[PDB]
Amino acid sequence: IAFDICGVQPMNSPTGQVFALRAVYKKFPALAASTQTTVGDIYTHFFQETGTVYLQASVQVTIDAGATDAAKLDAEIKKQMEAGALVEIAEGMATSIAELQEGFNGSTDNPWNEMGFRIDKQVIEAKSRQLKAAYSIELAQDLRAVHGMDADAELSGILATEIMLEINREVVDWINYSAQVGKSGMTLTPGSKAGVFDFQDPIDIRGARWAGESFKALLFQIDKEAVEIARQTGRGEGNFIIASRNVVNVLASVDTGISYAAQGLATGFSTDTTKSVFAGVLGGKYRVYIDQYAKQDYFTVGYKGPNEMDAGIYYAPYVALTPLRGSDPKNFQPVMGFKTRYGIGINPFAILNSLGKNAYFRRVYVKGI
Amino acid sequence: IAFDICGVQPMNSPTGQVFALRAVYKKFPALAASTQTTVGDIYTHFFQETGTVYLQASVQVTIDAGATDAAKLDAEIKKQMEAGALVEIAEGMATSIAELQEGFNGSTDNPWNEMGFRIDKQVIEAKSRQLKAAYSIELAQDLRAVHGMDADAELSGILATEIMLEINREVVDWINYSAQVGKSGMTLTPGSKAGVFDFQDPIDIRGARWAGESFKALLFQIDKEAVEIARQTGRGEGNFIIASRNVVNVLASVDTGISYAAQGLATGFSTDTTKSVFAGVLGGKYRVYIDQYAKQDYFTVGYKGPNEMDAGIYYAPYVALTPLRGSDPKNFQPVMGFKTRYGIGINPFAILNSLGKNAYFRRVYVKGI
Amino acid sequence: NLIAFDICGVQPMNSPTGQVFALRAVYKKFPALAASTQTTVGDIYTHFFQETGTVYLQASVQVTIDAGATDAAKLDAEIKKQMEAGALVEIAEGMATSIAELQEGFNGSTDNPWNEMGFRIDKQVIEAKSRQLKAAYSIELAQDLRAVHGMDADAELSGILATEIMLEINREVVDWINYSAQVGKSGMTLTPGSKAGVFDFQDPIDIRGARWAGESFKALLFQIDKEAVEIARQTGRGEGNFIIASRNVVNVLASVDTGISYAAQGLATGFSTDTTKSVFAGVLGGKYRVYIDQYAKQDYFTVGYKGPNEMDAGIYYAPYVALTPLRGSDPKNFQPVMGFKTRYGIGINPFAILNSLGKNAYFRRVYVKGI
Amino acid sequence: AFDICGVQPMNSPTGQVFALRAVYKKFPALAASTQTTVGDIYTHFFQETGTVYLQASVQVTIDAGATDAAKLDAEIKKQMEAGALVEIAEGMATSIAELQEGFNGSTDNPWNEMGFRIDKQVIEAKSRQLKAAYSIELAQDLRAVHGMDADAELSGILATEIMLEINREVVDWINYSAQVGKSGMTLTPGSKAGVFDFQDPIDIRGARWAGESFKALLFQIDKEAVEIARQTGRGEGNFIIASRNVVNVLASVDTGISYAAQGLATGFSTDTTKSVFAGVLGGKYRVYIDQYAKQDYFTVGYKGPNEMDAGIYYAPYVALTPLRGSDPKNFQPVMGFKTRYGIGINPFAILNSLGKNAYFRRVYVKGI
Amino acid sequence: AFDICGVQPMNSPTGQVFALRAVYKKFPALAASTQTTVGDIYTHFFQETGTVYLQASVQVTIDAGATDAAKLDAEIKKQMEAGALVEIAEGMATSIAELQEGFNGSTDNPWNEMGFRIDKQVIEAKSRQLKAAYSIELAQDLRAVHGMDADAELSGILATEIMLEINREVVDWINYSAQVGKSGMTLTPGSKAGVFDFQDPIDIRGARWAGESFKALLFQIDKEAVEIARQTGRGEGNFIIASRNVVNVLASVDTGISYAAQGLATGFSTDTTKSVFAGVLGGKYRVYIDQYAKQDYFTVGYKGPNEMDAGIYYAPYVALTPLRGSDPKNFQPVMGFKTRYGIGINPFAILNSLGKNAYFRRVYVKGI
């Protein structure tokens, strides 16, 4: 039943389609020897080391007029930077120019720009899941005769649960195939291991002591992943986490009164285990699932809007729990099960071109728990 | 009453039977010199140190075509890895291939959809148990004369308590016998001692500082056992813990106010002791009961579903607390006593097929408390 | 003014001599593992290692243990490897029980296996043992206590003395508890680096490597729980329900778990309005009802068990007489006396004072150093 | 992102907004042989480090033989070490000015204008507009396949995008005009003059782990808020505009300063509600997430209760006026909207906006 | 405006206020061969680290063969370790003094006295005035454009400013009459005699990061508060007046000491109302922001329940009295406000006030 998690847009035919709100997808004069900068303006300089900077003047200062040697010029600029005379910003300076130029050169013309979205569609097959039931008469006969049980019906209900669990696994698995590698690039700590959050590694845990602090550090990496999702998808920051039992046990220990075992269950001695759902209030940024089938130890930060076209992944059921019945006359032993067909969708990002591309999701390997 | 964690059903006739819902029960091309990786694709390489890792490309980078020296290749791969160009993931690869291959050329066979269960039944006798009061007239005369007591009325309450305790012991005993050795196989720490958790052993306690962290390390092993139960049963994570008083007190010392001492009785100066129930729920997940008769010191993790038929162990009280009364003329001392006939059951897993074999339970010996 | 025996049985007398009752409890060839043995999962074999005697090993893996290991040293080596591999698992008494039940259960019979309730239940005779005190005071104070303070003199002395005799009998009970208590932190309750009967806060072993007092104090509690368990096991009645401990120990215990003891904040706020320090401090961890031994001689605590039944204490006191007055004067100086006598009788669960000293299963005493 | 600025809406371009624009002593030298008077202040230029004022705590003669300035400095240094002379700067500069005014005070007629100029600006109701630009087949399929409202939904998206762009623009002007923060008056001498680097021991003041480090940024924020208070003459920063990284950091401290929200915390896909403020940091700064942050930064700004006390203005005239049509090159549908509002700024003398806006301080952030 | 001072409001200039102005051991040596007497206190000079005062708990003979001061020190030290001899310094001086004073007590004729003289100061109702200078066009536009009462609202600003300016002036005088804080009795030996540098281990008592460094300032504040009690004879500092930076520092320490008036922040600057105390530092000192702080600093001061125990007096005579007219030279309207109040301090003797007033101690701040 792990479909609330994504868009569904159920099909009424295989191939068969879903929709997604796919996104559309520094010129400063000079900072130079003998030039007096003007306060509030910005000048550009290439340092002999580490490329260029863009510095805003706070001080109207003439910089080393005799510095025909960049080494001297660099030194004076550094002194002026220390002085606060000249201050470095990078992309933000690009912005100031863009705003400066468009403001001063603004005109009516007819510059209707576009919503930042391509908006697109996919044709998907109603991919199915199932294998043969094979159950006996005698069993069914005694379940009813002994306890008044509905026999086959109960067995069927169990089976139906197993179907949903297998689907849930597939949905999650697809997230974890299409998801981009998290804790990478824009989301790395300079001293990191490039993709693994190692609780025993001071860098990943930002120098944390005690489980309290290192656990918060994990959530911090999660916040970073959510931001990258916003940066690449344009739909806002990551809105959910799917994670291994180890990860949730850790995150559950952050903010304390957040993740639940649905302990009313245990209180009553396993009254309804509901092992298909989530349980809680971690932070306030991510909806969350406890992946009981996690192969080892990881988390993935995802996103989902209120609109079904704003998932980045889709579950579009065509056939669900459609009963299959029969028997083999050689012994008349019965067949009871269900057929299903649902198919998946994945925002294009242009399965081979989905693997490692899905900007709505970032997958991180977890170590050290 | 141990009968919170077993199936009951029960029997209105010995021989006689119970039901049990029994279970039916990394290939990448290469990461090598001169190969330009493709973003999202996964490449494999065995390092001269560490061994094989699998890295997922984030960057379309040629891995040093001149790195014909495996040492040089390791250096280049490591460099690209540090760069975040190639990121290490472990289980992620195992699952990625499985879907890639199945998706690409999958099929359906003749999938009259199933549940991964055989579901079966076991015939049981109403195995008896019985106790005798074994008391004298002289005692009875004075309990009445001295305290105004109803003599064997009290002995009866004690005796009844004693027989139900013995029954409860038998349930626990069979769980402990049926349990597979825990902290074994899939649940071992490489430096571990095979089936025993030793609080003085830095491996078992994961380098823990003082009792606080060490006690939590025990909790950690318990969760690992609970998972193994889910893996083998196909039903779910352990729902209860049976453990020695030492272990329960240990578990009670971490994960806050879970296990209760029935503090109202302590406050009132032993108005009762009520030492006959589950102490509480560990992690909000496992009901934990005290093994009042533990042979050594230990814990057992077990699973119990909502269905009585999903216990792994069964108890069927056809006859219980039937009083006996009389005298024996040789000493003419009174006769008072109790008898019961309940029988036990196991999930057959084909007693001979459950001792040290039953998937529903895992048992670990505990040292060092 | 309190008995401080609210953790023990009374069974009061109607005559000296005099008696109490107590619910005294009544009180398989695993086949040798050998070279070439093909084990079977769940089966248990006996193995004698050249070092440290025997173990019992359960198969987790259906494996042959080196048929060429005719040398016990080789057999041990293969076994150790199989243990490292998780193939073979060591448990001792925990196995003895499974073999016993399988064998006894399978080969059982209706016959006549009626087992007894696990209780003997017996009685003791107690004389109304007496204790007594005198005021030993002077008349000149009685005269001026009245003239100067408006005091009732003798009346206050009487109250003081009555208090003292009650405190002294309560002290006597504690001494008997400590006398009879078994030594705690002993046998079943020892760790490998332990010191047999004493918890030392300056000893890294006792504090289990604790960081500062918070953790060290908790370590003391952990030892207390272990004591409670051993008591439970030996008496067959369950975990210790109360603690008697010295001022230093109690203050330590009250420094953890936030509110186990009453601080007597009403009393303190009002500047010692009525101290009544003859009362239980409160409940440790919500588990043990704890009383302060205001007369502790060394520094210590005793953990003990008490059921709801007066016959389930392990120690008994049967008040026959209390505060019977004395009045007179000593002609050697004609100074006055006031006084009291009590009579009560005490008992101890038989546990067979000869069978009491260091033998009383309901209690475990541990000394504490380093506070 | 207009509830953090004055609005003063237009009913005509040009058009204008109003703002509460603010209007905008020889201590005797200490010398050799001079005995100080306790509590008195003297001027002294050290050969090394220049001038300080020296306050006497001790009535001490400063080495009558100290002809050489080097000797005079040495005796002063010794007297300083001894606590006899205390080295101070501007607190005294004000003390003497007030002392002197007291001394030379006179009834006269010293009426002084409250320190305000109070002024106005003429503004153009600058327009903005976006179009749907979409294929008809898409719209036909959206409806035909799932009963979606097709072009109607695109219209809703577009209206949203326009509003987001307007907020974007307001932020961009704030970050155009904002002064450079973590500079001047708000620097630690060992700092990088404008960038807060979480990997840099100085910026984080040697903080132990993230908790303390995150607070260190909030401390820098308070320093910025103060500089704003000082320069505007109206009060400390009241709000923050920041990148998600910065907001997430600040939201990680002080338990509940940001919206805990706990309704979108463990479960699945109900909403994202991405149209609101993150909360109030420290109970002081209303904070909004810059969904278009280019790299990683934040700005601290002041906003008073009056329309005239924002330092920046947004004056809506026209909103979401629809466009409908098609592009004949392929006859594909067009929908869209146009708005008009216009902006303003405290004059501060966009010529006088760039890097001059006293109501705001912009800080570049890295290392998160 | 200030109102944490004595007010004793005047009904005339000159005109006066009152103030409750302040008036302002032969231990036996411990020695070789001497058996001590329990409870007695002996003095001993160790060859190293000066002297101690040791009280006998044990009647022990201190090594009669210790004729060598080095041996004597060793035995004394050992008996001290033994608990035989217990060390206290001034506490012993007090105990022996009491013994001596009690023992030799006599009526004689030293009737003692409250250690006060109590005095009076005549003060003028010093005036202050501000102008409006509002133009006609401004008024026409504020009414025409926003429906504003123009001059009336600008007047509210003007009146507020004269109130604030006086409040500022009162504080300024406190900051000059105050004695140098972090001086003498309140210094760390390695200090700079009056400035607290949050980056300097000496001032921050070895503290790690801003958290503990900031806490170290609280320590210095408590030291100042004590010095005030020591010299005033009336009590320890009760309040802190400090720069925004310092108040923010204090706010960050122990958290609940001061508040943002976060309801105003929450409501988007409904008001700022920052004319009241931020809170109470540590639950001990009421703390308020000097929004006009010149550099960066804090002053610790004492205030008794009696107006005459303030150390500073403000005795308002005239306040916020409006000016009305016009000026035909440009024919613009005339508005403004005036006050009269008068101030003074208790010097415990600005000529006799600067750097002298025991009620207050002022410290410079660096390194935040």
**A269 CB within 8 Å of a chain B CB:** yes
CB contact set of A6 (below 8 Å; sequence gap of 6+): A171, A304, A311, A312, A313, A314, A315, D269
Which residues from B are below 8 Å from A324, CB to CB?
Answer: 112-113
What crossing angle do the helices spanning A91-104 and D151-177 adopt, rounded to 10°?
100
Tell me if D40 and E297 make a contact (CB, 8 A cut-off): no
Which residues from D are below 8 Å from E195, CB to CB?
Answer: 87-88
| Structure token pair of residue C366 | 């541990």
C residues 273-302 lying closer than 8 A (beta carbon) to B: 283, 285-289
Of residues B17, B96, B304, nearest to A269 (C-beta): B304
**Whole-angstrom Cα distance, residue C322 to residue B183?**
61
**D271 CB within 8 Å of a chain E CB:** no
**B144 CB within 8 Å of a chain C CB:** no
- DSSP H or E segment with residue B249: helix B245-252
**Whole-angstrom Cα distance, residue B264 to residue E65?**
67
Q: How far off is chain B from C335, nearest CA to CA, in Å?
A: 44
**Whole-angstrom Cα distance, residue C79 to residue C83?**
6
- DSSP H or E segment with residue C6: none
Strand partners, A181: A363
| Structure token pair of residue A367 | 């170590």
Q: Are E249 and E257 in contact (CB under 8 A)?
A: no
Q: Which residue of B has its CA nearest to C229?
A: B245
Residue E149 burial (CB count, 10 A) = 13
Nearest CA-CA partner of B224 in B23, B21, B89, B364? B364
Token pair 């759902």 in the structure block, residue: A277
| Structure token pair of residue A80 | 């002026």
Interface test with D, best of E209, E249, E255, E320 (most D CBs within 10 A): E209
Nearest 5°: the CA angle D231, D233, D238 is 85
Which residues from A are below 8 Å from D217, CB to CB?
Answer: none
Q: Are A163 and A129 in contact (CB under 8 A)?
A: yes
Q: Which residue of D has its CA nearest to E187?
A: D83
| Structure token pair of residue E81 | 């370790």
CA distances from B283 to B149, B197, B224 (A): 45, 19, 13
| Structure token pair of residue A230 | 């916003």
Strands (E), chain E: 16-19, 41-45, 51-56, 85-87, 119-122, 127-131, 178-180, 195-197, 239-243, 279-281, 285-290, 297-301, 312-314, 318-327, 332-340, 343-345, 357-366
User: Using the 8-state DSSP alphabet, how is residue E47 labeled?
Assistant: S
**Whole-angstrom Cα distance, residue B42 to residue A214?**
30
Q: How far off is chain A from B315, nearest CA to CA, in Å?
A: 16
Which parts of D178-287 fold into alpha helices (H)?
A: 209-232, 244-250
**D211 CB within 8 Å of a chain E CB:** no
Which residues from B are below 8 Å from A146, CB to CB?
Answer: 17, 19
Resolution (A): 5.1
| Structure token pair of residue C226 | 């272990």
Strand partners, D312: D345
Nearest 5°: the CA angle B63, B64, B69 is 110
CB contact set of D157 (below 8 Å; sequence gap of 6+): A21, A115, A117
Which residues from B are below 8 Å from A139, CB to CB?
Answer: 119-121
Q: Are D231 and D358 in contact (CB under 8 A)?
A: yes
Coil, helix or strand at residue A166: helix
Which residues from C are below 8 Å from B166, CB to CB?
Answer: 115
Cα separation of the two ends of chain A:
29
Q: D–A contact (≥3 CB pairs within 8 Å)?
A: yes
**Whole-angstrom Cα distance, residue A129 to residue A344?**
12
Amino acid identity, residue B31? L
**Whole-angstrom Cα distance, residue C236 to residue C76?**
39
CB contact set of C71 (below 8 Å; sequence gap of 6+): none
Which residues from C are below 8 Å from B271, CB to CB?
Answer: 308
The set of long-range contacts for D110-113, using a CB threshold of 8 Å and a minimum separation of 24, is D110/E129, D111/E129, D111/E130, D111/E131, D111/E323, D111/E336, D112/E129, D112/E130, D112/E131, D113/D23, D113/E130, D113/E131, D113/E132, D113/E133
Q: Which residue of A has its CA nearest to B104?
A: A351
Q: Are B170 and B340 in contact (CB under 8 A)?
A: no
Nearest CA-CA partner of E289 in E207, E197, E168? E168
Amino acid identity, residue B90? A
Q: What was the elucidation method? A: cryo-EM
Q: Which residue of D has its CA nearest to A232?
A: D292
Tell me if C308 and B253 make a contact (CB, 8 A cut-off): no
Buried b (16+ CB within 10 A) or exposed e, B340-350: bbbbbbbbbbe
Buried b (16+ CB within 10 A) or exposed e, B192-211: bbbbbbbbebeebbeebebb
**Whole-angstrom Cα distance, residue B292 to residue B278?**
11
**B209 CB within 8 Å of a chain C CB:** yes
**Whole-angstrom Cα distance, residue A364 to residue A367?**
10
Amino acid identity, residue D184? G
Q: Are B43 and B53 in contact (CB under 8 A)?
A: no
Token pair 């912005």 in the structure block, residue: A95
Nearest CA-CA partner of A331 in A132, A133, A138, A131? A138
Interface test with E, best of D36, D101, D114 (most E CBs within 10 A): D114
Q: How far off is chain A from B114, nearest CA to CA, in Å?
A: 4
B residues 248-267 lying closer than 8 A (beta carbon) to C: 249-250, 253, 260-261, 263, 266-267
Nearest CA-CA partner of B288 in B260, B267, B320? B260
Strand partners, B41: none
Q: Are B340 and B14 in contact (CB under 8 A)?
A: no
Q: How far off is chain A from D117, nearest CA to CA, in Å?
A: 23
Q: How far off is chain D from A285, nearest CA to CA, in Å?
A: 6
**Whole-angstrom Cα distance, residue B66 to residue B85?**
18
Q: How far off is chain B from C68, nearest CA to CA, in Å?
A: 24
- DSSP H or E segment with residue C212: helix C212-235
User: Using the 8-state DSSP alphabet, how is residue B318 labeled?
Assistant: S
Q: Are A1 and A25 in contact (CB under 8 A)?
A: no
Interface test with D, best of A18, A112, A209 (most D CBs within 10 A): A112
Nearest CA-CA partner of A249 in B253, B282, B305, B90? B282
Of residues D153, D244, D262, nearest to A281 (C-beta): D262
Amino acid identity, residue D309? D
**Whole-angstrom Cα distance, residue B42 to residue B30?**
8
Buried b (16+ CB within 10 A) or exposed e, E197-220: bbbbeebbeebebbbbbbbbbbeb
Which residues from A are below 8 Å from B223, CB to CB?
Answer: 245, 249
Coil, helix or strand at residue D45: strand
**Whole-angstrom Cα distance, residue E293 to residue E300?**
15
Strands (E), A163-221: 179-181, 196-198
Provide the CA C356 distance to its chain's centre, in angstroms. 13
Q: Are A233 and A303 in contact (CB under 8 A)?
A: yes
**D223 CB within 8 Å of a chain E CB:** yes
Q: What are phi and psi for residue C77, nearest 5 degrees?
A: -60, -40
Q: Which residue of B has its CA nearest to A321?
A: B113
CA distances from A31 to A43, A76, B36, B264, D364 (A): 5, 11, 40, 79, 20
Of residues A162, A196, A295, nearest to B91 (C-beta): A295
Tell me if A287 and D270 make a contact (CB, 8 A cut-off): yes
| Structure token pair of residue C288 | 């043990």
Q: Which residue of A has its CA nearest to B83?
A: A194
Coil, helix or strand at residue D344: strand
User: Using the 8-state DSSP alphabet, how is residue D114 labeled?
Assistant: -
Of all residues in chain D, what percent are helix, strand and coil, respectively (each to 5)? 25, 25, 45
A186 by Cβ neighbours in 10 Å (0-12 / 13-18 / 19+) ranks as middle
Q: Are C12 and C319 in contact (CB under 8 A)?
A: yes
**E142 CB within 8 Å of a chain D CB:** yes
Q: B–A contact (≥3 CB pairs within 8 Å)?
A: yes
| Structure token pair of residue E263 | 């309801």
Strand D343-345 relative to strand D312-314, pairing: antiparallel
Token pair 């409501």 in the structure block, residue: E267
**Whole-angstrom Cα distance, residue C242 to residue D216?**
50
Tell me if B356 and C86 make a contact (CB, 8 A cut-off): no
| Structure token pair of residue A357 | 């591309």
Coil, helix or strand at residue B110: coil
Tell me if D294 and A240 make a contact (CB, 8 A cut-off): no
| Structure token pair of residue E183 | 């001086």
Q: How far off is chain D from A19, nearest CA to CA, in Å?
A: 8
Q: Are C228 and B252 in contact (CB under 8 A)?
A: no
**A174 CB within 8 Å of a chain B CB:** yes
**D101 CB within 8 Å of a chain E CB:** no
Q: Which residue of D has its CA nearest to A13?
A: D145
**Whole-angstrom Cα distance, residue C316 to residue C127?**
12
